[PDB]
Design a binder for this molecule. Structure first.
Ligand SMILES: Clc1ccccc1Nc1ncnc(-n2cccc2)n1
Ligand SMILES: Clc1ccccc1Nc1ncnc(-n2cccc2)n1
Ligand code: NI
Lengths: 236, 236, 236, 234
């Protein structure tokens, strides 16, 4: 088989809702042992229940990607009980601090999990960009800045780790049906749909399928890529 | 009396330029995923070879003769396919020319005209079925130097812009249009590997896996995208 | 300076083209502006005279090799070789023909004027993209496609002719104050201005000033570039 | 094209591209404050401006320190007026890019008050010159350029409504101190990748910066203008 993730341990941050949950379920369905994380104990319990309800081995844990202690501790804990995670999905005025903080977190987590991947001479790091919602300028500015940061970062880290058969890729979601987007005013939703050639919102499962492919052996020559998953609507 | 459980079961896929290398590998991968595959070549001997290969690999389908530069040949071949096998709802355009057939403008122009010719012909079938996949394969990183870098960048820029525009035109019909941009694919050698983070050439099968994913139902929200498959070496 | 240099500006009878001819003239070039009709050419000649610019208005069909060859010969006969050339002369499914036609015309003209520039070992070719003309969707598709074609073409031609100290650049206008843009409803106008960080439309003179800089000796190391002049609103 | 009546701050103005920018802005009629990280660099800047007939000054600035930035700005307002034109010219890839963007943000954010008050402004960011390299060099260079483009584009959106434009210039291979001293093999290889078949002069970057600082560039914002003789790197 070419799509089996059987025998692998996958860490998926921000797995309690929406895109993160769908990614955990998809990696599990493909046979991985899945560790989903949230920022709170209640989120982590929920993750564990969801995985069990769907017949997936793994666990839910509490993780703050902004803290070196939390990252180090969580990783240790994972190695203790479950093995090295060789698949890692990072899903966890204002634009500069946001992007800066996000990239520092991506770097923190990525750098921590690389030892394990370097040892195993195999790895998959996949970064999930932020969903498209807010309008006028400030939402477009945040969205374009975050995406640009994500592309550059992903491209650079891919170069640094490539010789070790570790691939680093990103997924850039467009307008996806999630908690934030279900709440959005009718006018926003209509405007947005008008910009989308497929004339509909993406499902969270449609992001998860892309992540699952990238995590497979078939994607082994794909690295430094950002795959946009946005129904044909492009926005820089 | 035997139904495959493979993701493209029940579909008919047309793959142009299927007699060698990347095109052959795509035909085999689509077939392995359960599609009925029609591979094309420009000559009767190429087509006969395609048919034998498919048979040797247990794939249902056929090899046919097709000149993507002629409206007659395209119309005729499509009619023939409907006659005997059904509407092809997956189409992979791989048969691009090169300067071996000043040079950058005529190459890119000719290739885009052929992409448009074929795509436009198959759209009626896809429009009726309210479902489709068109995937365009870019050219392999060919010549080493200057005129080679100009041809390569021009072809890739044309491929991206085209793919993005066609995706907009056909999106409302649940037809996705995507592209794959190969880097250095195997079918002084040390210098090259030094420019590639993965430190190796890509296999033709690694392009075929990406095409196979994009043809699936999981890639349904992915459209207008160019997925680079180049081991981390980027050149514009 | 541009003093004593001969500049050919296609589509110079109205708007952006006229503003470019006047700006190049103000910078001291001898300006040949073109139109597709005799009445347009007379108008060009009157405008230049009214503004104290030496030069002429001529009739030129950029889609015809004869017209191009003839017009060039005429220019050499009476005025000298034009070493500055500005190409300005140009529902969801008209994009392919438009872009194709525009690129063939750019190539035709550029290739014709290169012999003169090659002999002088000096040159400036500047390509003006289209304004966001019609709107909604088909207008965004046409615009993005035209711009992508313009960027790739400009970049490739720049590579081909660089060794001869000829620079090839492009200018990508956003929303400029023109006939099409003056005519849309107040709600349209307000929406549009909301998408533009500068909160206003561009003047044609603001395109001309960029062209004038690129034609100068100061821009001699700038080539293959597309300078966007769009008040901060980006749409690909 | 006149920058008469304006005050321009040009960081890293002691050598090469920075010096050429300070001289070009001065030639266009601006009052120019060039900065260096040391007192000797600042003294040199002042002498060069004087030798070339340019009003202004050289001063000491550390773009990585909020105190230095705040102090230098206050100092400029004290003696010369608010600078409405600002040119930012002043394992390893992540810290470099991060630090550079933090410095761009620090300085840009500080000078914006003055520009916001005047409802007019020009911020221009100069990217790094090509080629001090290995593979780690290509990674640093591409990462820095991507950060510069995204940053420039975002800041332009944030400040546009105030008639402040934010742009960038992306140099290719330019004849400078660092590049003259590069191994001859590097230099030859690089020259082979450039369609114009020559190195850029520092003056050729300065001319672009000068144009972008002018009123004629008022509708240009969020742009990164590459100035690289046709050699593009991805
Ligand atoms: Cl805008 C911004 C703010 C902080 C960090 C990055 C960006 N933008 C951006 N755009 C492309 N690449 C990067 N980058 C790459 C490595 C580190 C930052 N950053
Ligand atoms: Cl003809 C050509 C030559 C060199 C580089 C590009 C092109 N054409 C081109 N380039 C980018 N986009 C497009 N495009 C988009 C829709 C149709 C063509 N066409
Ligand atoms: Ni324990």
């Amino acid at each position: 088989q070419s799509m089996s993730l059987q025998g692998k341990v996958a860490l998926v941050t921000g797995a309690s809702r929406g895109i993160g949950q769908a990614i955990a379920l998809e990696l599990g369905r493909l046979g991985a042992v899945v560790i989903g994380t949230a920022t709170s104990a209640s989120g982590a319990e929920k993750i564990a229940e969801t995985l069990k309800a769907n017949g997936v081995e793994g666990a839910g844990l509490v993780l703050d990607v902004s803290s070196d202690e939390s990252v180090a501790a969580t990783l240790e804990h994972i190695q203790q009980h479950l093995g090295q995670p060789l698949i890692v999905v990072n899903n966890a005025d204002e634009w500069f601090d946001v992007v800066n903080t996000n990239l520092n977190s991506l770097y923190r987590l990525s750098k921590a999990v690389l030892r394990g991947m370097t040892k195993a001479r195999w790895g998959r790091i996949i970064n999930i960009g932020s969903v498209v919602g807010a309008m006028g300028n400030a939402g477009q500015t945040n969205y374009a800045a975050a995406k640009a940061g994500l592309e550059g970062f992903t491209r650079a880290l891919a170069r640094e780790v490539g010789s070790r058969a570790i691939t680093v890729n990103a997924v850039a979601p467009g307008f996806i049906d999630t908690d934030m987007t279900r709440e959005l005013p009718e006018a926003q939703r209509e405007a947005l749909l008008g910009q989308i050639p497929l004339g509909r919102l993406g499902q969270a499962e449609e992001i998860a399928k892309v992540v699952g492919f990238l995590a497979s052996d078939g994607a082994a020559y794909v690295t430094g890529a950002t795959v946009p998953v946005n129904g044909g609507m492009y926005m820089s």
